Amino acid sequence: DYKVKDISLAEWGRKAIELAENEMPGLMELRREYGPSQPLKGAKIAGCLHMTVQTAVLIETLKALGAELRWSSCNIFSTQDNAAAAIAKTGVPVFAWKGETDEEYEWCIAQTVKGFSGDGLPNMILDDGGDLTNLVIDRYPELVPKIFGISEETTTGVKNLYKRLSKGNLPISAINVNDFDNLYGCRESLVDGIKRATDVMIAGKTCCVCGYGDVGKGCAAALRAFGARVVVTEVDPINALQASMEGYQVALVEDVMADAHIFVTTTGNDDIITSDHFPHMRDDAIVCNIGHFDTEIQVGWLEANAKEHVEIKPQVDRYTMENGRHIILLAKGRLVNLGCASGHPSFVMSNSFTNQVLAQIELWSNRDNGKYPRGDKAGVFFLPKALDEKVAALHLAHVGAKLTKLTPKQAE
Amino acid sequence: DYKVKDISLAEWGRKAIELAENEMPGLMELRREYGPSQPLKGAKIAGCLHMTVQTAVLIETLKALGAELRWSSCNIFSTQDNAAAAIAKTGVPVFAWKGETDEEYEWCIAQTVKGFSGDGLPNMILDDGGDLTNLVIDRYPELVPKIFGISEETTTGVKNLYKRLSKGNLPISAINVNDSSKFDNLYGCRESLVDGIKRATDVMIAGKTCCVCGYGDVGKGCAAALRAFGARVVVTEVDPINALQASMEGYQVALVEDVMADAHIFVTTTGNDDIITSDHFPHMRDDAIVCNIGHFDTEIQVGWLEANAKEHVEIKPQVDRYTMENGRHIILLAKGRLVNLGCASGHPSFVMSNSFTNQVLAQIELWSNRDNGKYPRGDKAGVFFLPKALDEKVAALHLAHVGAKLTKLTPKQAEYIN
Amino acid sequence: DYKVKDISLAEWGRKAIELAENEMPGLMELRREYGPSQPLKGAKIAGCLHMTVQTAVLIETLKALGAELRWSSCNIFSTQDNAAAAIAKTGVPVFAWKGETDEEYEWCIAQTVKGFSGDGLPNMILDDGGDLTNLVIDRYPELVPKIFGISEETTTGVKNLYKRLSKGNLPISAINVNDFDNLYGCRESLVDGIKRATDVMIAGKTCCVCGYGDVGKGCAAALRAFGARVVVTEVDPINALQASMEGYQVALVEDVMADAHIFVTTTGNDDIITSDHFPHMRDDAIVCNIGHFDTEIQVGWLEANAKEHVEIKPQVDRYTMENGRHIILLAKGRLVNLGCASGHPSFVMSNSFTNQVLAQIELWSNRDNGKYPRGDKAGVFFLPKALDEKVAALHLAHVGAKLTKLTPKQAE
Amino acid sequence: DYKVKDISLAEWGRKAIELAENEMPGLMELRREYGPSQPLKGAKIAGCLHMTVQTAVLIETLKALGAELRWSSCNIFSTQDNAAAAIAKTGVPVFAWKGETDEEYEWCIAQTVKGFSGDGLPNMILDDGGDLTNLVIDRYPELVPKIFGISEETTTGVKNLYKRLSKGNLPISAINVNDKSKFDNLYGCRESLVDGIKRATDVMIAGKTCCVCGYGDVGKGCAAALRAFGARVVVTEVDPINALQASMEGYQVALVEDVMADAHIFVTTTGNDDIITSDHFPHMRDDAIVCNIGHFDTEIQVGWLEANAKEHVEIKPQVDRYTMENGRHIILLAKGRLVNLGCASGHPSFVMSNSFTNQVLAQIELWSNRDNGKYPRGDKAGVFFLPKALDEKVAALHLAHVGAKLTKLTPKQAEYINCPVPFK
Ligand SMILES: NC(=O)c1ccc[n+]([C@@H]2O[C@H](COP(=O)([O-])OP(=O)(O)OC[C@H]3O[C@@H](n4cnc5c(N)ncnc54)[C@H](O)[C@@H]3O)[C@@H](O)[C@H]2O)c1
Ligand SMILES: NC(=O)c1ccc[n+]([C@@H]2O[C@H](COP(=O)([O-])OP(=O)(O)OC[C@H]3O[C@@H](n4cnc5c(N)ncnc54)[C@H](O)[C@@H]3O)[C@@H](O)[C@H]2O)c1
Ligand SMILES: NC(=O)c1ccc[n+]([C@@H]2O[C@H](COP(=O)([O-])OP(=O)(O)OC[C@H]3O[C@@H](n4cnc5c(N)ncnc54)[C@H](O)[C@@H]3O)[C@@H](O)[C@H]2O)c1
Ligand SMILES: NC(=O)c1ccc[n+]([C@@H]2O[C@H](COP(=O)([O-])OP(=O)(O)OC[C@H]3O[C@@H](n4cnc5c(N)ncnc54)[C@H](O)[C@@H]3O)[C@@H](O)[C@H]2O)c1
């Protein structure tokens, strides 16, 4: 009752998972604190989130708290096969491998919304990006009354929730967990992706980072840390001013398309790098995306219009254009940190995932309350604000950070 | 109808103000856009904010939109005398000079609460730190019902608004301009902290160990500034979120006791009392530098220090050297008053343009909604943020200066971003 | 007449090499400029230097100029098997694979000092770290008078040359090529190696960087950029003062050994991380070396005293001590950038490799006029200072750097 | 026997000097170690070096070691009047004030070249820029045979010596102290560049575009300073090596004319003339700030700016605003003279301690070897560096102040580096 690339990678995955646990004290602490009470006993969680070593620790936290889970990846190139095998070996139903086709992707999510114990139906959703949420609401309406809550990981997913809400298409309440982890995360995993794919030198290069939210900020800091000159693009005046204040030129993509060695899309929006840009790119320009959906880059156009295509090695594709110059595309435009490397490290993921677990507890344990209503009163909510202090404190010992104590006088 | 140190500094103040104007396109654009409609005609603003070159651009912006003003500074050591004189010369009543006594300070704020046209009473408050807000509510109860609104500049001022509200002591509605700090507080301090320390002491930053107390936007800027020059910064915090942030930024997070013997420089940024104490001074290395950049000097136990030192020498104004029983020295900046304004010129005018543009839009907002119950007087009185569309407006006004070019969304892109 | 791991990796290695050529304008310009004149015709170069994609470009540059070459790697873990294969395929004798044993390592170097055309002997040495130099001098006395020069890449190798000279044991003249590129290289490749090995988060960590020469400076800057707190150790007061001026605490290994998450040795010296340190290290502390020799870390002691060992994957080993805690060792203490990632990237390797080619021309072409004496008068020399300018100039267009012209009046 | 602005600034001067002392352990330790033996007893030193608080500590170190000194500043706008006053009040002949005229500047130097005990003549030169060196050689040839050595502080002065030498015009031997430069220049400018700009103008660095011309140690420090505060720096260079370094550090390398219309701030650091010219001023954006941190003001064509501006306003001393014919303004700092010293206090004490400690060791070295020909007078004269091992000695003196703990090599480790228990 699983489908993965190679069950024999399980032993390697288990060792890697053991290393991540030691980097994920938030998750390990929730097991110690909540294990005895089993606050997720009864929960049947359909999960759609990149099947990584980090996610494996999230799954075993939810399981240790009593949940039953069925799992798939939310991207065709993000699964870490050793992690998926490590989880599959333990008997958790998981349907994930690195390098899925579109139809295999859709097949995998569908395996997670049936096959549980009892009537075989999920009662909880854990998503990021919003593919499992959209699949259930739009293609399993009979499931909709069965689901007590959604927890959502990422900006793109959160925007999908409000999109649905505004026009009466959200029948299940959600907890927004996405709302600087993604700044610090991309600060280390963007260049990891790029280097594993190309080994290219960052120092001395001109780079074009499109967008300057938390993800752009982190990407821009990462490249600049290594001696790249970063040019930023933005549609928002607030973020553009912040980029200038941080020492970056803010320009149009067209202003730099002929000089940039590297292009990185962070917008969460479509058609950022287009047919109007590719013909003008310098020889062997590197093109990649770190936004949730690959459509930030017109990959379709690029493949259809190149005179020649060579695969350097998986997720590194080199295209020869009519003009004779080359373009290097990473992970076919899919999120480059997970596509070409390992995504965000454990320590930062511990923050986000500790909230994921808390969001699942909060929705499950209030399923009959009208606190998170189903149907027409359904909304999008935040975790109670005291939990942000809870999560943060759980990570201080690991870094040796020692907190000062207010005196009675100071508190008041 | 004013009191400043020296009216002859007016011409120099005027030239500095003209340079500031060129660095404050937000304020200069408000004059262009709103001059015609005189939206503040009838407003009588009592202002209590550091009387600097930057504040003069603010005053003359409010004046150009039709307001009547009386002004004081919100700190005894923050006034720039040339800017105060330039304003006095124009006929705006201003009561401010660098180096006021506590009594002169209180006198100055009292001058802003009378002497207008008509009944002579203010109808609006623009405040920084809350001294004038407290003065009106606590000492002028007859005046309270004539004040249509407060705009507050700073974090501690905002903290004071909520504390008041929670005790049933806030009868006037306020707009929170500090949180409308992402900019003012971080970018501002990142440049003005070391400027203050340098003008005061000429000390090298590289090689030093610095203790930065607190890690909000103010502490983040300060720490970034000392770090950039090659200092090793140790951060202290009571809040786990902020402490994790500091550690993610490469800083050791520790107690003041952990570094008190090693730190060349101590900077308090908490907005709280008793950060650097009697428990700390006796253990500091020779010529350790102590300063504060939070709103009130009581972050440092200045009183205890002055009382317990064996000798005191004034190196130059706002730079004081204390010899302890140790035989060792401590250098104190601006008697613990905000060091950037006390020893240098505070935040540069570019970033002040952001906070002051907001300040003006807030006075406009509160003033024009006079008869609305949108900003209730009496029992329903609250703290409000500026309407959110204005944050984009303000940012946009500062982009041309920096040569920042915005991308235009296509119709399809615009549809699917809203 | 070669020995590599897998010849079928050649096609992949060739694509990698083609991408590197584009990032190495120095070497490609030498081919264009010196191709016609064949300045190395007759030279028979025994080469001992990390068999990487970058080195493959160097090998082909030397061959394009007329050299005959036989190659080995100067480290058991640094070879990139795709690069070794692509070179082997062309018919250049190379004896290198990732994961050599010591006997295999020695055998590989033996293969490069015999088997050329004519009498089968080399007449030129290209070295990285001194091993090939030491082999010829100490174990091949008959060969010594046949070698017309040595060029040496690295600090450790340069110190070995001056040591030999001072004892009268240098019978062959050398060009010191080592003498910032190591700073820029390590700043990008130290973290690349740590991350490919462990996927650990850098932000929030305490790191102990031993040594503050160009390598240490780059390592510290890398770790600091990702938000680590770096403590530096030094024996030289000049380097120690620089580290303080750059914002780093300078302390002893024993001052931080209990708290450091990562240890990085950069000294070029032995016994930096010892039996006096391992037992006090926190759980899952990461220990790695980026200096030329592994003996900076007491790996033999660690392995002999660990109560448990687990290979997480090749070149990542976790040791359980008697105290119950774990130590993570990267590449068995061998240079971590090369052993766990790909080493310095192409662009920066182009600087020193352009100089290697030039040193080799210089030595070879002046082999008879006594400019570089053999025997008693042998010395260590530098390239003429005007070549430093020429090499740098070849790399400016790639980064879009526009040089200002002095006016005639400014020149004087 | 002195000429300063205002002897009543002596009290302030002295307090500041005492604080500087605490920041200058190199000089303070040399006082302690060489005091008893009086190595400079007999030395008569003509000094020409910015008359700052830092220099005062240097002066008093030299006197504490037995020297007679006569001092002038090496720049018109760099004297700190409180420091000069404190020095004069001790009875050391000093001729220096902030804001000297050219004529007064030369007069000041002339006063240092006579008036000692005995025949009233100097036998040593401590220089910064080469002005005093050039006066003695070109204008006092009867004095050349009397001078036992020159110690030179700065890059420009060192260029001046090599230039002289190559034309047979160096008859006194010099110690190159500048090559110090790894420290003084980079770390010093990194803090003092922006200090000068801000004291002058209070301008925000964040968000600005800056043109930094040259990328030697000074340009590197100036670029790092501006970038730290969030400015975007464009670097200009004539040397491919430096240009590649700037590029590997994340800076665009371009021509002045590529960024002259966009730049808010211009900083010249080349040590060369005619960097910012009549070709640039007319295209500058409104209130562009132009300054120089290189030794001579002629990097910027100030003569031209002043003669061609339609309006001039002195904002305050050393801050001058010019209205061009196009109606736009240009803000010039310290009339193009070194901005860190001209508009602020120069490099801070701690870093000057390294440079000045070398200065003292250079004077001891030249003086104590005067009758043995190690440093030849006459046609055999040349430029030398300090003994190699003094570098480590100087650096080690400054480690305690910053709390840096040195690792001690074991005997086995010293064998391997092949060094004593000098290192590099
Ligand atoms: N790969 C990862 O590990 C990772 C991590 C977090 C988030 N994400 C995804 O990355 C994306 C960005 O996340 P975020 O939190 O920064 O979102 P964000 O919305 O805060 O940032 C996007 C920014 O892009 C700007 N933008 C939109 N269209 C643009 C265009 N036409 N040109 C230039 N700028 C444009 C917007 O103004 C906005 O400031 C989202 O899709 C999110 O789901 C990925
Ligand atoms: N000088 C200026 O130009 C300037 C500019 C902006 C704000 N301010 C003032 O600076 C102060 C701080 O502003 P902010 O926006 O950063 O406020 P903030 O509330 O966001 O930051 C203060 C931080 O200090 C911490 N803290 C509180 N007590 C502490 C203690 N005893 N020890 C260690 N940490 C402690 C809190 O956790 C908090 O993170 C306020 O007084 C504000 O008005 C001054
Ligand atoms: N892995 C790579 O890609 C790479 C690149 C260049 C150089 N290297 C090698 O790295 C090593 C360092 O190179 P470098 O150029 O920085 O040389 P370096 O000699 O300039 O730096 C070594 C530093 O370590 C210090 N040191 C020596 N022993 C010490 C000890 N016991 N404790 C603390 N500090 C000590 C020295 O004082 C010196 O400052 C050499 O072995 C060199 O060949 C490796
Ligand atoms: N103000 C101070 O405290 C201070 C401190 C140290 C040195 N200095 C002075 O600063 C100047 C520079 O010192 P440095 O040590 O950096 O010298 P340097 O010679 O090492 O650097 C100057 C750089 O400028 C470049 N350059 C020359 N002409 C150029 C031009 N036309 N356009 C662009 N680049 C050009 C050169 O290639 C060189 O790299 C000297 O005059 C020195 O004496 C001042």
Ligand SMILES: Nc1ncnc2c1ncn2[C@@H]1O[C@H](CO)[C@@H](O)[C@H]1O
């Ligand atoms: N290593 C990882 N494992 C699982 N999810 C990750 C990892 N790195 C990033 N992500 C998540 O992917 C989401 C975008 O799809 C981001 O919000 C981010 O949290």
Ligand SMILES: Nc1ncnc2c1ncn2[C@@H]1O[C@H](CO)[C@@H](O)[C@H]1O
């Ligand atoms: N130059 C300045 N002029 C006026 N107000 C300033 C200046 N610099 C800082 N401030 C304000 O002082 C407040 C703290 O009292 C901060 O909110 C900050 O905005």
Ligand SMILES: Nc1ncnc2c1ncn2[C@@H]1O[C@H](CO)[C@@H](O)[C@H]1O
């Ligand atoms: N990718 C690489 N290919 C070949 N040599 C490298 C590479 N990266 C680093 N090196 C060299 O290894 C030497 C240390 O033995 C360093 O001086 C460095 O130049």
Ligand SMILES: Nc1ncnc2c1ncn2[C@@H]1O[C@H](CO)[C@@H](O)[C@H]1O
């Ligand atoms: N505070 C200072 N006192 C004296 N000289 C200084 C000071 N700051 C910089 N300088 C020197 O000015 C010389 C250039 O004229 C530089 O070599 C620099 O060392």
